[PDB]
Every structure is written in C-alpha cells, then in structure tokens.
C-alpha cells in the first residue's frame, strides 16, 4: 500500500473516532451552558480533556505521512489541518510558560476591576460596569476616567505578559516554518496547488491595504460628519481639524461608533423602525420568532430545521433556579445534532439575531456531508458573513411588511433611509479602520518592525493617522492599550472582522441580483428567491473542501475580496455625507491632542 | 403451526450487523399479512415478490436475518449497494428474492451517554459474498509491517461501535432490520399459509 492509501485509511479511522469524541465533548459543553452547575463544569472538563488529548495523539500520528507523497488534494487538506503542530512544536517548558501567560492575561481581563476614587469598595468591572459608562454616559470626565483607569490599572498589568507572549508565539510560529506569528495567522487565507485559485499569506496584507484605500473617502466623510456633530455637543473639547478623542466613541475602545447615534442622528424627529410593539401586540413568543426565521430560509429553497432542533435547543431563558449562559450561539454537535442556545426576548433585536444564528445552522447542515476536518467555513470570515446577510434582508421594511409586523400604510422617505444608513455606517464602516489598524500594529510587532520601547508610541501614531482617533492622556511604554481589548489579550486574530465585512456585501449584492431586486442595495430582501438560495447553497455545502477563492466565486463570480459592494451599499449615505460636509473640514490633523494645552 | 416471527421482530436485543443473526423458519404457517399490519412500521421493500400477494405461494425454507444499523445505512440493505455495511457486514445478492423490513429503535437501542453494544466492521481485505458473515477480530494490517495482534501504526481493530445516544439525528439513530429470504429448492413445500 502507498503512503497516500495509508493516509486514507488513517483519516477513515480518525473521522469515526473524532465524531464520537467531539459529540461527547459538545454534549457535555451544552449541558453546562444550559445548566451552570458544579458537576457540569467537571463533566465538561473531563469530556473536553479527552477530546484535546485525542487530537494531540492523532496529530502526532498524522505527521507520520509525508504530505509531498500525497497527490489527492482533499486528502492533503485533511492531513495538513491535522498535522498542524501549533504550540506543540515548542519545548514542554516553553509551552507551559505560554499557556500560563495566556491564562493570566485572560484572568486579568475578565477579573480586572477599577475602583472609584475616595471609595476603595465601589469598584467596577469592565462588564457591565465600565462598558455601561462607555456606552451611555455623556459626561466627558466620567468617560475619561473609565477609559484611562481601565488602561492604567489593567493594561499595565498586561504589558510585561504581552512582551513574553510575543516572544514565545514567534518562536512557535518560526518553528512551524512561518516568518512570525502574524504570518502564521494569515495562513488561514493560504491556498496552494490549485491553478487559478491560489493565494499567498503575504497577499492578504496587500489586498487588505488596497481595499482600505478605497474605504478612506467614505470613512473621512463619516469621520468629518461625526466630528462636527460631536463638536456641537462638546465645543471646548473637540478641534474642528483634529482627531476624535478616544473616550468619546461609544465603547471602551471605539471599536464601533454605534452608540454615537443619539448625538449624530441626521433627522432626529423621525423614529426608527421598531416592530417590538407589534410583536407584543400579536402575542409572539420565542418559538414564533424561530418559526418565522425557519420560514425565511424555506422560502429561498433551504431545508427546514430538524426535529431534534426544536426538541433539543434552548430558545428561552430557563428562568428561576436553573442558570445558563445567555449568549446567542449556534451549535453543531455533529451526527445530525444541530441546536441554538439563546435566551430570546420578544424584541426586534432578538428577531434579527434568530435569523443570524439560524444562518449558522443552515451553513452547518449544508456541509455536514463533508469529512469531519472539512466541516467549517471556507475561511475565518465566511461563517459570520453568512449570518450577517440574513439579518440584512429580515430587517428591511419590505420584509417586515410581508410578515405582518410593519404597517402597510407606513411609508419610507429618504430621511429614514439616511437615518438607517448612518446607523449602519457607525457600526460597519466605523469599525473597518479600527480593525485594520489594530491588526496592522500586531502584524508589525510580530514581524519585528516596532521595537518594544516604541510599542505605545507607534500604537497612537497609527491611531491618529489611520483611524483619526487621538488618546486623551499621554501613554508611555508602561501601558499596553491594545491588550485592553478582549481579542488581543485572549489571543484571537482580528482581521477576520475586516474580510467578513467585505464578504457579506459581496454575498448580499450577488444574492439580491439573483433575486432580481430593483433599487438601492440596502432595501433588498432575498425572501421567496430560490435562485438566490441555490446560489448560496452551492457555496455552503463546500465547507472547507475547496479554496475560499473558489467558494467565493460560486456566490459572487469573483475570486477575491472586493470592496465595491460595500461602497454600493453605502452610496446614498456617501453622497449625503459629502453634501453635509461642504462647509466642514474633511480629514484630520494628527498633532492636535486633548491634552496639548 | 404458526411461524415464530415474534421471536425475531420482538427480540429484546438485536445482533450487531457484523455478527448478523439468522433464524431459519420451517414447517409452519406464516401470515405475512399479520406482520405487515403492525404499529411500528417504516421500510418494507420486497424484491422479486409482492407484499400484497405474500402468503399465497409456498417456499422450501424462509430465513430471517436481523441486525441493527443507523438510519442512513438502511439504504445499503438492498441488491447492488455499496458502503461499509454492504461491503463488510451484510451483503444481499443481485438476484435477491425477499423483503427488507426496518424500523426506528431509538427508544430501545439508545442510551444517554452512548449505547456501545452494537458494532460494525470498518475495514476488511475484501468485500463480502452475498449472505456471508465475518465475525473475526483480526487486527487489520493497513501497512506492510505485521501487527503482532495489537493495534498500532497502520494496525487498526476492524470493528467500530455506534455509540447510540437518543439525541442523535434520524440518520444516526439505531434501526432494527429484518431481512426475509425466500428459498425454493428441489423439495416439497414447508412454509406457506394465509
Ligand atoms: C440541572 O442541574 C440540577 C442540579 O442537579 C438538576 O436538579 C436539574 O434536574 C438539572 N436540569 C436539567 C434540565 O438537566
Ligand atoms: C480523493 O479521495 C476521496 C476519498 O478520500 C475520493 O472520494 C475522491 O474521489 C478522491 N479524489 C481524487 C481526485 O482522486
Ligand atoms: C511538527 O513537529 C513534529 C515534532 O514535534 C515534527 O515531526 C513535524 O514534522 C512538525 N510539523 C510541522 C508542519 O512543523
Ligand atoms: C420539513 O417539511 C416537510 C414538508 O415540506 C415535512 O415533510 C418534514 O417533516 C419537515 N421536517 C421536519 C423536521 O419537520
Ligand atoms: C413571500 O411569499 C409569501 C407567500 O408564499 C407571501 O406571503 C410573502 O408576502 C412573500 N414575501 C415577499 C417579500 O415577497
Ligand atoms: C428627499 O427627497 C426630496 C424629494 O423627493 C428632496 O427634496 C430632499 O432634499 C431629499 N432629502 C434627502 C435627505 O435626501
Ligand atoms: Zn454569528
């Protein structure tokens, strides 16, 4: 038997053994997240440890088959993903040091508390304490206190840990024959051996920077409009030509500008579309919300939810004694078991989240026939993009009127269109420079282009230049403000939120064209279009079996990430922003700072 | 004499498909119509015979093969089928003359935490002949190095378990199958009756 034939038999044994052990771990994990007990924590750990030990053993056995002697690519993809060393390429001591560093940074982030001055007992955590301040407070000093105290008392603890974290992660990546840990993260987009669909790791940097140049004009006019509105609210705190102070952006970091809507709403006398009252008027419950979401996917040709979905999912808060983790999640336990965990309320937000989460389920059900190691999104940004486009169609007035939640007499004028697009841009467009700049800083740190004694100097030079955001207090190199965000201190790649954002509007534009939608893209509803559902399903069933460039081509006809659909979505707002900024300064100077005086 | 079909369909435990059980039925009256009008009924496909006009002709011997597989594998209990079950566990001939009966047994053969009583053969040197049974436990040699009787690199135990849990999808839930073979040799009729 050849080496490839032995690998096929090895993967055959792995699949049946992995599915069983993955199901037992997922089932134990489900029982804890729906029934937070002490016994369920141990059963979740016992089942989880057996699954992690199985993967570690199978990874070593997989490295006994040389990839070069395998020619069938679908076999090479499964072997490659299983042969991935990760932290197991380091010595046992250095991997133990790294895991201790990772746990300490995660513990500092989740337990980090800030105490109000003159009262060492009135202390606040990030969630919900500091997050509530950064999302609702209009007081300049209260927001400044929360922004600075979080970074000066929790961020400074993470600075020495993050320095050693970079050293060990780079040693791990370079031992896996990567340039550095950032190049290791960019491997998620790598494709080799498929003529016409290949993609290098360094190509991601060029494509992200190239598409971001086309985003700058829209962002600069969004930035200039927000600055002018905030300048009317804080006249003595904001310069007409300077960056936006970092603590006045809607959350702890300015990751999204969503909470700036109250102060920046273009037409503040026209109310939003909130069908929450109509859902309560019609006595809707959680099952009705997911039944309507099920009807949505059925209307485009996708299958209904399984019988086990309705029986095994937790669509309502268990209430009273039995506690649960109420964060909405879509579960793919394998072996035909699909569930959704969600403490659903009768609101419009949960109505849209249900369509978002059930989009993950439709994705999981579509590639369930793939081999175990290929059951995932085409890349890290595919799964979340599929979920986002479901809430896009479900939130439109055209869709809400077809299901009886929005009044037919309710008419939509261009002022409510601008209000909606501005609300969308604060979340979607506002996060793109944040995401790109944060990941570029980490890429350069891992690449060695930023010395340790200039980490925070370069972090805020890039905030001012790229993001147009200035720190309200000067920070020396004892700070580690990037680590004050969850994803940085918890070792998660961040560029996935940039690529996913561009993917979702490429998906939506393609599906709406298949649905023969006429008019602006943001008003599209793909409901009742089996042609759009068929075009989406051709990519969903692929899973990870094909290059993501080919999976993207099945939906949109293009092989690469493209920013034009994003700009098409926001064009009515872009033209309105350019007219609003005609007597305002567009762009920002980088030398002004709120503490310069 | 009524044919002992109750011992086959209503057995407490079914056999594993790799060690499928066969019960020879002889010298009795079989109301093939009284077995078709039951509650728990799902798959009932006959080949070469007619289920409407079942208990009308006579056979020399009737064989009842019973085992358990998952839902998505009931399709393999048919002539000219491929897959782990049809190739390595239970194979029907191309000219099969009989009926295949299957029903969902998730209430009996599943258990919270996993029921590992039922096994199936995952690897074998060659495919099975029709109505052949292989209960060997020889370590399958996938490579060239001998296995010495223990599992190791390129040396796998040939039998795999289902681990039936009641929360599986229908395609993974246990199904009890009964295969009725109808033989007609050069001997006077022994099994027929309305
Ligand atoms: C949750 O755990 C408690 C603690 O033993 C138990 O009494 C209860 O029956 C469990 N509920 C479910 C739905 O498993
Ligand atoms: C690759 O192997 C799989 C089985 O692992 C097989 O189904 C498929 O046809 C093979 N493809 C090629 C191109 O050989
Ligand atoms: C992973 O490390 C093992 C040794 O721990 C080695 O045998 C294998 O070749 C390595 N694989 C890669 C891709 O670095
Ligand atoms: C899905 O809908 C079909 C009818 O189109 C129905 O026969 C089937 O039972 C449904 N599936 C579930 C799990 O309810
Ligand atoms: C979709 O079709 C249903 C009937 O099948 C109809 O009630 C609904 O209004 C339609 N919605 C759209 C957006 O066409
Ligand atoms: C909305 O359209 C009307 C004409 O229908 C126009 O006069 C008005 O300026 C428009 N407003 C915006 C914000 O586009
Ligand atoms: Zn999601």
Residue numbers in the entry:
A (entry chain A): 19 to 615
B (entry chain B): 334 to 527
Authors' text:
Earlier measurements of the contributions of individual mutations to binding affinity (Dejnirattisai et al., 2022) show that G496S and the triple-mutation S371L, S373P, and S375F reduce binding by 2-fold and 2.2-fold, respectively, whereas BA.2 lacks G496S and has S371F. This may account for some of the difference, but more likely mutations on the edge of the ACE2 footprint (R408S and D405N only present in BA.2, G446S and G496S only present in BA.1) enhance binding of BA.2 to ACE2. Structural differences are observed at RBD residue G446 and at ACE2 H34 whose side chain has rotated ∼120° relative to the BA. RBD/ACE2 complex (Han et al., 2022; McCallum et al., 2022).
S is the major surface glycoprotein on the SARS-CoV-2 virion and is involved in viral attachment to target cells via the interaction of cell-surface-expressed angiotensin-converting enzyme 2 (ACE2) with the receptor binding site, at the tip of the receptor binding domain (RBD), in the S1 fragment of S (Lan et al., 2020). Following attachment, cleavage of S releases S1, allowing a major conformational change in S2, exposing a hydrophobic loop that executes fusion of viral and host cell membranes, releasing the viral genome to initiate viral replication (Walls et al., 2017). In-depth structure-and-function analyses of 27 potent RBD-binding mAbs isolated from vaccinated volunteers following breakthrough Omicron-BA.1 infection reveals that they are focused in two main clusters within the RBD, with potent right-shoulder antibodies showing increased prevalence. In summary, we have presented a structure-function analysis of potent human antibodies induced by Omicron BA.1 breakthrough infection in SARS-CoV-2 vaccinated individuals.
